[PDB]
Structure formats: structure tokens, C-alpha cells
CSV table of C-alpha atoms and ligand atoms in Angstrom, one decimal:
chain,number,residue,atom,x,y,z
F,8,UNK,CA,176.1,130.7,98.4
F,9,UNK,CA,172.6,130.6,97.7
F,10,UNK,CA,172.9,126.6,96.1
F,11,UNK,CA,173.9,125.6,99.7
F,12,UNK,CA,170.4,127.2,100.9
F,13,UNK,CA,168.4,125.5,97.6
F,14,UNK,CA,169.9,122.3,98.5
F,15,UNK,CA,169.1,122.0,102.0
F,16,UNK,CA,165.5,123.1,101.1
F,17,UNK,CA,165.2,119.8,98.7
F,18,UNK,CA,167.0,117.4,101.7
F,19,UNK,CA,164.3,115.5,103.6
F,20,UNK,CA,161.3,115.5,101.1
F,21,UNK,CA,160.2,114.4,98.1
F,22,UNK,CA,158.8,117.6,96.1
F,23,UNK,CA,157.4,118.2,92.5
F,24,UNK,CA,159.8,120.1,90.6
F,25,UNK,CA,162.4,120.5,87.5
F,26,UNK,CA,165.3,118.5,86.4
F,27,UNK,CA,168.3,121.3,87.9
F,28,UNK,CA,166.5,120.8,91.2
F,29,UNK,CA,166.7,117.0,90.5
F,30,UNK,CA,170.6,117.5,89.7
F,31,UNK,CA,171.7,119.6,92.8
F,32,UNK,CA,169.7,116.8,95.3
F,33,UNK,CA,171.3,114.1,93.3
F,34,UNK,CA,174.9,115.5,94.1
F,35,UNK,CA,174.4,114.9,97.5
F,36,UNK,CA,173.8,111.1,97.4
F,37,UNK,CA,177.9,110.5,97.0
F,52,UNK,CA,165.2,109.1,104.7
F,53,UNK,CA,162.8,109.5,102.2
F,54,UNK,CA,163.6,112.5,99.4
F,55,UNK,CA,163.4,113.2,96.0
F,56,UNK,CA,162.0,115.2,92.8
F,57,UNK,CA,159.7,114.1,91.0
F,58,UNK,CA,159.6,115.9,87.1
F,59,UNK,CA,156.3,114.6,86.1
F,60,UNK,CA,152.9,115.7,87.4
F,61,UNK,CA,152.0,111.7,86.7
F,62,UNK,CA,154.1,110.9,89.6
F,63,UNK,CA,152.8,113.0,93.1
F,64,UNK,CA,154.1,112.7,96.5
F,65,UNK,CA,151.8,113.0,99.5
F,66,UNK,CA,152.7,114.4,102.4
F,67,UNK,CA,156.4,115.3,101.8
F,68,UNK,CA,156.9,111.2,100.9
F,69,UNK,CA,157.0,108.8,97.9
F,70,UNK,CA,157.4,105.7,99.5
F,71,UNK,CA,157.7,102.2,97.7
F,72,UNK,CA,154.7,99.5,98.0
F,73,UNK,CA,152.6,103.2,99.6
F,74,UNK,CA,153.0,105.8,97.2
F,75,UNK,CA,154.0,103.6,94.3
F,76,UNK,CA,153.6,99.8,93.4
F,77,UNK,CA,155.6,97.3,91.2
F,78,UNK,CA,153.6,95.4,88.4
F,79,UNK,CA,151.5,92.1,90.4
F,80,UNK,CA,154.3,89.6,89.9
F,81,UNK,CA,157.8,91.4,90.8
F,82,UNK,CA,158.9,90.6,87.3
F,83,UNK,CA,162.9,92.8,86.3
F,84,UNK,CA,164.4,93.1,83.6
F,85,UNK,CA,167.8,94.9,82.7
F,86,UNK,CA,171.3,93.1,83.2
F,87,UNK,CA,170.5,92.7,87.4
F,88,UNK,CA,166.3,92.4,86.8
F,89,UNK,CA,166.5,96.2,88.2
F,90,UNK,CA,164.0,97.7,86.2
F,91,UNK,CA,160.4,97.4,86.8
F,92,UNK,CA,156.6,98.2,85.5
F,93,UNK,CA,154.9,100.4,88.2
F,94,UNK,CA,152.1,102.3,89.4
F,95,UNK,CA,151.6,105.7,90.8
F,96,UNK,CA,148.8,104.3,93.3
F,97,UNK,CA,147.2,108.0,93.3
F,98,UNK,CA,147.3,109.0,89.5
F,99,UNK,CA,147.4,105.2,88.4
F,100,UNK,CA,150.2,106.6,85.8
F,101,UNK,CA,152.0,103.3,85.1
F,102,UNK,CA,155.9,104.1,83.9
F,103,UNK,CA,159.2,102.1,84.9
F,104,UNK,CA,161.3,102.7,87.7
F,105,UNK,CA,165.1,101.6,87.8
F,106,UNK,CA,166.5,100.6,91.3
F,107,UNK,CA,170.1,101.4,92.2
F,108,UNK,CA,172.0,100.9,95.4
F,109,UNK,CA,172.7,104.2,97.3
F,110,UNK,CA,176.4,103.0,98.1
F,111,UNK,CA,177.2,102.6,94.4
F,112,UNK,CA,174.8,105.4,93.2
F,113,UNK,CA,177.2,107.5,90.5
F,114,UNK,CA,176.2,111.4,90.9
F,115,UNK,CA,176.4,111.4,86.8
F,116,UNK,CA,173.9,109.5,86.2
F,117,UNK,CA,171.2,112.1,86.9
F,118,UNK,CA,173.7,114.8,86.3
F,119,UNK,CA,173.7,113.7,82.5
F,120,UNK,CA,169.9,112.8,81.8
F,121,UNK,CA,168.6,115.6,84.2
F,122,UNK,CA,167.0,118.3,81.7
F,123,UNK,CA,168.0,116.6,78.8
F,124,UNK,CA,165.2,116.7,75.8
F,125,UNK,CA,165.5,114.3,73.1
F,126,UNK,CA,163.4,112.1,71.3
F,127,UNK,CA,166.1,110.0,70.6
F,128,UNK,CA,167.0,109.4,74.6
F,129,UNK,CA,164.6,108.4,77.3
F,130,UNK,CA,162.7,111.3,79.0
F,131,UNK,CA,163.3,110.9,83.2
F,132,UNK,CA,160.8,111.3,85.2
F,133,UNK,CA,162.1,111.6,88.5
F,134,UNK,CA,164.2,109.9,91.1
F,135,UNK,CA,163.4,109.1,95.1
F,136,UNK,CA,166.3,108.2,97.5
F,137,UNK,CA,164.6,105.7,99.9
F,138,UNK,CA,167.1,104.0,102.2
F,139,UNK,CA,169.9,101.5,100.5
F,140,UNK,CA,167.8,102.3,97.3
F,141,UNK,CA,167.6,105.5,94.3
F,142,UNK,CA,164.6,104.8,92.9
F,143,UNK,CA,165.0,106.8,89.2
F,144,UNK,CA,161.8,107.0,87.5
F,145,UNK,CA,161.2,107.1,83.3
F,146,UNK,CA,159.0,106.4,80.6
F,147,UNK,CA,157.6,102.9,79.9
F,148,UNK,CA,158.2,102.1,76.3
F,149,UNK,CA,156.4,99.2,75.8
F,150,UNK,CA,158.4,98.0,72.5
F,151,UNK,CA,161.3,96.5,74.8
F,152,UNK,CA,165.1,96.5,74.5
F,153,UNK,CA,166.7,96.3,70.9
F,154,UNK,CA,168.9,93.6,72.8
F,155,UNK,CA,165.1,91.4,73.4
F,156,UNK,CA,164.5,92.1,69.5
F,157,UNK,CA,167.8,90.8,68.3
F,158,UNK,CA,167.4,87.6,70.6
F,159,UNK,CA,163.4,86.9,69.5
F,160,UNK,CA,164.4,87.9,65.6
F,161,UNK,CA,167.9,86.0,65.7
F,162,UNK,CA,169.9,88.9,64.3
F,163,UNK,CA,168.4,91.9,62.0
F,164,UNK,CA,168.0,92.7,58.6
F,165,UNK,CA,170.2,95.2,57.0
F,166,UNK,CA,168.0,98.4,56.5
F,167,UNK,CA,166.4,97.6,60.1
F,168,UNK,CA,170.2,97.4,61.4
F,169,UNK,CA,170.9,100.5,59.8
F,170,UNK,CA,167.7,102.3,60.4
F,171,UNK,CA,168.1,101.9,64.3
F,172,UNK,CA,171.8,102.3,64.3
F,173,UNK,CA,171.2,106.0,62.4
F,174,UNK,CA,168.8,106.4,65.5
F,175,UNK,CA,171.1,105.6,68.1
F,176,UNK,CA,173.9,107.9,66.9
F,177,UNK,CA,171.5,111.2,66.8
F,178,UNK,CA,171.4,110.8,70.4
F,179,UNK,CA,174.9,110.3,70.5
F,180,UNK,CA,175.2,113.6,68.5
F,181,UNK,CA,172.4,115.6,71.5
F,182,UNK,CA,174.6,114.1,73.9
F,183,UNK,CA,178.2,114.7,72.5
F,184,UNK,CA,177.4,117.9,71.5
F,185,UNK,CA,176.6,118.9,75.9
F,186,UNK,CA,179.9,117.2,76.1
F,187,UNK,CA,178.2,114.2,77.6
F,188,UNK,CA,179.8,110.0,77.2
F,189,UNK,CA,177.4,107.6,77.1
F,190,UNK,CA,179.9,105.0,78.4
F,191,UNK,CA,178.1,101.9,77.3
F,192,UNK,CA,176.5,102.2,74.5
F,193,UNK,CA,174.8,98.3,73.3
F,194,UNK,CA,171.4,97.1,72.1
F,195,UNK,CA,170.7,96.6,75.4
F,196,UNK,CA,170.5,100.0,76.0
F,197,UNK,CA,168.1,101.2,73.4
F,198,UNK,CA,164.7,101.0,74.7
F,199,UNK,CA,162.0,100.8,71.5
F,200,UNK,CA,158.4,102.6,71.5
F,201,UNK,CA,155.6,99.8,70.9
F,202,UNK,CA,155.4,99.2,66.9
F,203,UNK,CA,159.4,99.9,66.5
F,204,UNK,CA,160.0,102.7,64.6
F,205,UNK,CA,161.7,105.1,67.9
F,206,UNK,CA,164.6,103.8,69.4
F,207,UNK,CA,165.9,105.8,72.3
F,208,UNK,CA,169.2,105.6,74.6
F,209,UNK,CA,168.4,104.6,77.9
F,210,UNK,CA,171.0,103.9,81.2
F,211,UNK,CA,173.2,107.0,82.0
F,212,UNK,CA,175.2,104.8,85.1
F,213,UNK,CA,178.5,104.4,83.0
F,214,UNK,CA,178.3,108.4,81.5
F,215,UNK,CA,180.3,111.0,82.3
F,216,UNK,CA,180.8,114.3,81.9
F,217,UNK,CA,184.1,115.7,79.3
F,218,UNK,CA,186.3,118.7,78.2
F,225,UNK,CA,191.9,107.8,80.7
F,226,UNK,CA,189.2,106.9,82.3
F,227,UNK,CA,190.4,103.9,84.6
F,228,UNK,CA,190.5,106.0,88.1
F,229,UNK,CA,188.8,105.3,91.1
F,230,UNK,CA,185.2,106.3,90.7
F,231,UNK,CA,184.9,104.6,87.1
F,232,UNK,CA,182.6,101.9,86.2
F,233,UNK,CA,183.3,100.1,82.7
F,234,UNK,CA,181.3,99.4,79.8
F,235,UNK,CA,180.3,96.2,78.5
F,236,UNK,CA,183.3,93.9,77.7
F,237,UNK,CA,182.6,92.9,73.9
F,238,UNK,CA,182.3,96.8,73.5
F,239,UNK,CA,185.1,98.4,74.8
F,240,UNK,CA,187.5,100.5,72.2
F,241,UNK,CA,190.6,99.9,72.3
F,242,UNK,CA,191.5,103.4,74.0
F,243,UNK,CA,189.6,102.3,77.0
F,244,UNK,CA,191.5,98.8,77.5
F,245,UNK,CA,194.8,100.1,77.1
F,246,UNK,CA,194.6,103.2,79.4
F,247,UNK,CA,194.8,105.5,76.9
F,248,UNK,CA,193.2,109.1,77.2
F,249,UNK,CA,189.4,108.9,75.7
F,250,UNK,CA,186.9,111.4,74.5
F,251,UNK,CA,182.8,110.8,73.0
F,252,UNK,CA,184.8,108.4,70.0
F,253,UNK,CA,184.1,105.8,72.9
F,254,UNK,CA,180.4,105.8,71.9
F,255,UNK,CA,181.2,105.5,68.2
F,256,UNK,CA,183.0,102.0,68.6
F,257,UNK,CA,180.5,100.7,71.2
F,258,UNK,CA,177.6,102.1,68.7
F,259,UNK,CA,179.8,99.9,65.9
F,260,UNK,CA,180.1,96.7,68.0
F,261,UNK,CA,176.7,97.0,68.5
F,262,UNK,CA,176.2,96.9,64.6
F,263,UNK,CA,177.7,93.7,64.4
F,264,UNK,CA,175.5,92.2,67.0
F,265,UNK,CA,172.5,93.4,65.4
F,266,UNK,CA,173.7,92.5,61.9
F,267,UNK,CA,175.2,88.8,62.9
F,268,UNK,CA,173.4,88.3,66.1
F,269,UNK,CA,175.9,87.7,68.5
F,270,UNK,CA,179.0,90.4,70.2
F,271,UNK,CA,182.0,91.0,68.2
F,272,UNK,CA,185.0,88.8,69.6
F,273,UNK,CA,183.0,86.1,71.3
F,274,UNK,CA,183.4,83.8,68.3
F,275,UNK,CA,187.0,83.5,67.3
F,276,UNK,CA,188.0,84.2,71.1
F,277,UNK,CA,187.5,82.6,74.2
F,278,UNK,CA,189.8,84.2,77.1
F,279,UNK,CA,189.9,87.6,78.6
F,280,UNK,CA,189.0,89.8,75.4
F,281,UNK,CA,189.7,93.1,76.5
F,282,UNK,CA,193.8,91.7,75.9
F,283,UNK,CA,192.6,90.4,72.0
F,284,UNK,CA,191.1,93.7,71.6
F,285,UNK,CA,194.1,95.9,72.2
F,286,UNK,CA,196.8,93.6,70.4
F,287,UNK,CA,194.6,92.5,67.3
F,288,UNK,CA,193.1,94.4,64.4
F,289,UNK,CA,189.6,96.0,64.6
F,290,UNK,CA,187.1,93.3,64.3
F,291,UNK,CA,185.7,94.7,60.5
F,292,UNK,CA,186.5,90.6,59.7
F,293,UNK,CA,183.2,90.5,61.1
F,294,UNK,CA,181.0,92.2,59.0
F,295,UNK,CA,179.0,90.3,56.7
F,296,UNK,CA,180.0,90.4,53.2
F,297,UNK,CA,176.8,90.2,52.1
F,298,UNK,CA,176.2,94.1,53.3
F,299,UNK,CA,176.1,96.9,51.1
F,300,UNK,CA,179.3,98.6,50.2
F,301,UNK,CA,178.2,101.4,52.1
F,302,UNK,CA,177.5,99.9,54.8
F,303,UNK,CA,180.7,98.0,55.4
F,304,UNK,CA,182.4,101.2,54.6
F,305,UNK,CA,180.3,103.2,57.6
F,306,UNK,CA,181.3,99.9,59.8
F,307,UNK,CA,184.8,100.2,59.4
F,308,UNK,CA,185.1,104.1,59.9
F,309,UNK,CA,183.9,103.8,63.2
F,310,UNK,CA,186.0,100.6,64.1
F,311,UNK,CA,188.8,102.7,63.7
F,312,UNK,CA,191.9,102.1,66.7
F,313,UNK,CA,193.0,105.4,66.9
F,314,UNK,CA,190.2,107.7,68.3
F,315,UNK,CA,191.7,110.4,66.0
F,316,UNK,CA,190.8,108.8,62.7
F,317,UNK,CA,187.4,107.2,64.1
F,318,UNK,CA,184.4,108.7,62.8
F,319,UNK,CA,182.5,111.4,65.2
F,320,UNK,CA,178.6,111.0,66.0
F,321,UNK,CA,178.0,113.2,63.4
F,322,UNK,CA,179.8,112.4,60.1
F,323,UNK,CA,179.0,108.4,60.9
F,324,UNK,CA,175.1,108.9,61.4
F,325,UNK,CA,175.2,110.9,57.7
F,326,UNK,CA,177.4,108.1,56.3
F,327,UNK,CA,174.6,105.6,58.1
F,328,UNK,CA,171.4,107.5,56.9
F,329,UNK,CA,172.9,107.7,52.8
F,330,UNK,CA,173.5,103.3,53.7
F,331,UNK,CA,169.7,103.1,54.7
F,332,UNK,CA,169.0,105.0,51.3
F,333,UNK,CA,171.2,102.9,49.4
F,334,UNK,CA,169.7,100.3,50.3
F,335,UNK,CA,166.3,101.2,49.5
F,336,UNK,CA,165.1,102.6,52.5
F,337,UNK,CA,163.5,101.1,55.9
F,338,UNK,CA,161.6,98.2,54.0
F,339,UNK,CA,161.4,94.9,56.3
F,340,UNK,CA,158.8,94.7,59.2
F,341,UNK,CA,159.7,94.8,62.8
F,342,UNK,CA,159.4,91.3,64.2
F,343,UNK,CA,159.4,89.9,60.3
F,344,UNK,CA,160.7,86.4,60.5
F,345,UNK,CA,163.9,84.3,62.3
F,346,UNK,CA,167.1,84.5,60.7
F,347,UNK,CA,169.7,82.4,62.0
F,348,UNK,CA,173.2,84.1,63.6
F,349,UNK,CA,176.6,83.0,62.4
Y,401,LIG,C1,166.6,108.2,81.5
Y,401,LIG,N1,167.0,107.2,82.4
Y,401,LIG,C2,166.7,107.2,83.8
Y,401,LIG,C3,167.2,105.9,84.4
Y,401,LIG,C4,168.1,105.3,83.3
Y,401,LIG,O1,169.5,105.6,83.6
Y,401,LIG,C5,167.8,103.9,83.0
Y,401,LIG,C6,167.7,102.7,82.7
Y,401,LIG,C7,167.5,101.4,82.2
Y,401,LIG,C8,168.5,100.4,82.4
Y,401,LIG,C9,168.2,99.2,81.9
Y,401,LIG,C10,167.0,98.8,81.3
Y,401,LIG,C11,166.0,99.8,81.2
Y,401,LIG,C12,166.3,101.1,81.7
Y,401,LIG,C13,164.7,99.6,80.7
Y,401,LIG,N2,163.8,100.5,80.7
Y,401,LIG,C14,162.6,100.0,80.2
Y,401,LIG,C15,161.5,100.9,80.0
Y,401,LIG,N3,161.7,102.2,80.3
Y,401,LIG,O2,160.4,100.5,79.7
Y,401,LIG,C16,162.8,98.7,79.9
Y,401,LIG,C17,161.8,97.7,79.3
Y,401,LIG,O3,162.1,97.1,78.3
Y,401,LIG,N4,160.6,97.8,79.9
Y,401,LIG,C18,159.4,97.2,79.4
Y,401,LIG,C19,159.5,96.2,78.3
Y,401,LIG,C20,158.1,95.6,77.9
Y,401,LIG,O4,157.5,95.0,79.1
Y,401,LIG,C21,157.3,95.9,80.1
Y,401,LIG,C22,158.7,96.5,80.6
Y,401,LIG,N5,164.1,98.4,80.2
Y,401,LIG,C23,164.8,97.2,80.1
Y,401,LIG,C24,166.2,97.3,79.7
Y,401,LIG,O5,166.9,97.5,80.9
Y,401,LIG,C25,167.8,106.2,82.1
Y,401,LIG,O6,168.3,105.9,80.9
């Protein structure tokens, strides 16, 4: 009875406070309010307004798949940090539900979010090193230990997050933020997770195309193996530079990938053993024999040793794709 009254206290401001606070507003969004969970980010006078409390980086430069996500400024602390618009009508309760009080180096830290208008403003930490989805593109594709080495990174915040019973949803190297010389690689955007115990009903938003395990596709009942072929797929972009499928098919792939083998063709033979055999175990169809979070990010860190360790530089030079 008393989250009725906590709620309703949170409803028409914008307040400094923690992530459950943050969680129980969130619900509510399917007027300016919000919760901020930095001290960096202060609002004045009940508000956090945008372009009066907070301002965008000189040119209104996005980036992201819709340019949603911006550099800003906290006018009164001058903390810069990004912010990630959403529109209010689409806005999926899980998305803050899932990040909110979550503690990870290995996922991106939130900062806050502010409903204002159409928009949910949802606040997080600038990391200045860019998407892993920019790297491959600049770089061509990555080198092997550098493939692995991030790879290994993304699936221990797989593990934090399967382990609160938590989906990513869309796991791809667009969604792994880097710190500024390379060597962190964090999961960012929560707006496909959700929250376990088929998931084409109503309120669900897919994942990215190229991605998508088979389970998903065909309507089949899904649990956190989802991640692990997403995480896979994304492997195979890092390591040949392009998404799996887009080569050898050219109509709606989501029909290819239920009827036709997993796409281990794919992997480069001049991998490692290892690291062809960590590949396939979490290209597996069936959900049931597909490697968890856990056993593939072991398999992953004995590939990076095998292969002598993380050796090549970040941004080292172009290697050409496929
Ligand atoms: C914990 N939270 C709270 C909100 C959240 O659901 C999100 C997100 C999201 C989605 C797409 C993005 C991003 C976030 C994103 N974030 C950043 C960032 N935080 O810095 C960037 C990025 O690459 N920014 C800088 C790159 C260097 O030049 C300055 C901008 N991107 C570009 C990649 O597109 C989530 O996960």
C-alpha cells in the first residue's frame, strides 16, 4: 500500500535519488519528472528541463541506429555525459526496470532518466572510446585475440545479467560502448530486455535481424541462450567484418535462418581451433545444447590464452572483410 504513496510522491518532479525510486516512476510511463542517480546531474527547482537545465553538444550531432544519443551538458555542474532520447508512446517500462541498480563494470552505469513531454530523456556515462560497431567499421574487421578479448567481455555482463534473470534482447557490436584507449567494453541499450523465469506477443520489440536465434524466428519458447547466439553472430562480424547471413543471402533472412544450418560456414578457417570450437557451441539451434554465459566466456577466455593473449593494438591497421 505504501508504493502507491512513494509513487505519487515521485510524479510531477524531478528529484535526486536511487535507482528503485528511478524503477517505481519508470512503471508509470506505460510534465516534467524524473530521478536523477548522479549528484553530476541536479535539478533546480523541482525541473530538469532540456536546452535550461541541460544542453546537447554545439552542433546537434546523434549517434545510435535513429542518431538518439547525444553528448551533453549539465549547465549547472558542467558534468558532460550522454543522454538517450526515446519517445514516451513507445517507452518499454523494462528498459529502466533492467539497468536501474544494476552495478557492473562490464554494463553501462545510468545516470538517470527525465520524462519531458513526447520525450524519456535516460541519462548515462559518456565513454569516449565509441561503439565496437564504429571500431569494426574504421578497422575493417578485428584481429583474432582483439575479437576474442572483447567477446570474453561482453559475455561477463551477459553472466551479471543472466544470473538477475535479466535478456539482453539485442545483443551486437553496436551495443558495446568502449572506454577511451579500448581495453573496457561495456553492454549498453536495455530497450529490447526483459525480464525471465515465446516472446512474439504484443508488447515485444525484436532484436537485430542478422542476430536473431533461431528460437526467436520460429516462435519457439526462449530463455538468456538468446544472448549467447546474438553474442556469436556478433563474433563473426567482428572477426569477418560484416553480419552473418548477409553474404550468401539476399531475401527475408529470418526464413534462411530457421530452415538452414547455423552459419559456423562462416567462421574463418584461419582461427584457432579453440576458437572455432567456442563459435560453434554457442551457434547451437536448439537452446538446450547452446552454450550458457558462463561455460562460453571460460571456453572464450582459455581461446584468448591460446592464442597468446591480448597482443594487437586497438586501432592497429585495416584489414579488409570477406
Ligand atoms: C545504461 N543505459 C541507459 C540507456 C541505455 O539503454 C542506452 C543506450 C544507447 C543506445 C545506443 C547507443 C548508445 C547508448 C551510446 N552511448 C554512448 C555513450 N554512452 O557514450 C555512445 C557513444 O558512442 N558516444 C560517444 C562516442 C564518442 O563521441 C562522443 C559520443 N553511444 C552510441 C551507440 O548508440 C543504456 O544502456
Amino acid at each position: 500500500p505504501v508504493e502507491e504513496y512513494l509513487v505519487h510522491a515521485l510524479q510531477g518532479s524531478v528529484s535526486s535519488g536511487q535507482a528503485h525510486s528511478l524503477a517505481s516512476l519508470a512503471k508509470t510511463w506505460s510534465d516534467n519528472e524524473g530521478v536523477l542517480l548522479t549528484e553530476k546531474l541536479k535539478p533546480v527547482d523541482y525541473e530538469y528541463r532540456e536546452e535550461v537545465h541541460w544542453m546537447t553538444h554545439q552542433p546537434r550531432v546523434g549517434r545510435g541506429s535513429f542518431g538518439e544519443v547525444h553528448r551533453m551538458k549539465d549547465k549547472q555542474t558542467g558534468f558532460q555525459c550522454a543522454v538517450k532520447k526515446v519517445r514516451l508512446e513507445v517507452f518499454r517500462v523494462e528498459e529502466l526496470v533492467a539497468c536501474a541498480g544494476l552495478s557492473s563494470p562490464r554494463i553501462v552505469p545510468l545516470y538517470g532518466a527525465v520524462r519531458e513531454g513526447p520525450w524519456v530523456n535516460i541519462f548515462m556515462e559518456l565513454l569516449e572510446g565509441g561503439s565496437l560497431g564504429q571500431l569494426i567499421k574504421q578497422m575493417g574487421c578485428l584481429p583474432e585475440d582483439r575479437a576474442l578479448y572483447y567477446l570474453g567481455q561482453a559475455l561477463e555482463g551477459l553472466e551479471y545479467l543472466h544470473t538477475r534473470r535479466i535478456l539482453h534482447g539485442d545483443v551486437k557490436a553496436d551495443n558495446v560502448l568502449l572506454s577511451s584507449d579500448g581495453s573496457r567494453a561495456a553492454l549498453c541499450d536495455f530497450g529490447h530486455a526483459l525480464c525471465l523465469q515465446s516472446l512474439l506477443t504484443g508488447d515485444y520489440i525484436p532484436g537485430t535481424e542478422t542476430h536473431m536465434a533461431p528460437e526467436v524466428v520460429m516462435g519457439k519458447p526462449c530463455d538468456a541462450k538468446v544472448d549467447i547466439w546474438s553474442s556469436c553472430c556478433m563474433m563473426l562480424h567482428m572477426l569477418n567484418g560484416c553480419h552473418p547471413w548477409t553474404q550468401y543471402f539476399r531475401g527475408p533472412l529470418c526464413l534462411k535462418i530457421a530452415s538452414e544450418p547455423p552459419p559456423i560456414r562462416e567462421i574463418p578457417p584461419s582461427c584457432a581451433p579453440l576458437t572455432a570450437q567456442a563459435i560453434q557451441e554457442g551457434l547451437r539451434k536448439e537452446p538446450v545444447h547452446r552454450a550458457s554465459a558462463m561455460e562460453l566466456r571460460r571456453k572464450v577466455g582459455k581461446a584468448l590464452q591460446e592464442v597468446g593473449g591480448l597482443k594487437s593494438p586497438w586501432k592497429g591497421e585495416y584489414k579488409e572483410p570477406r
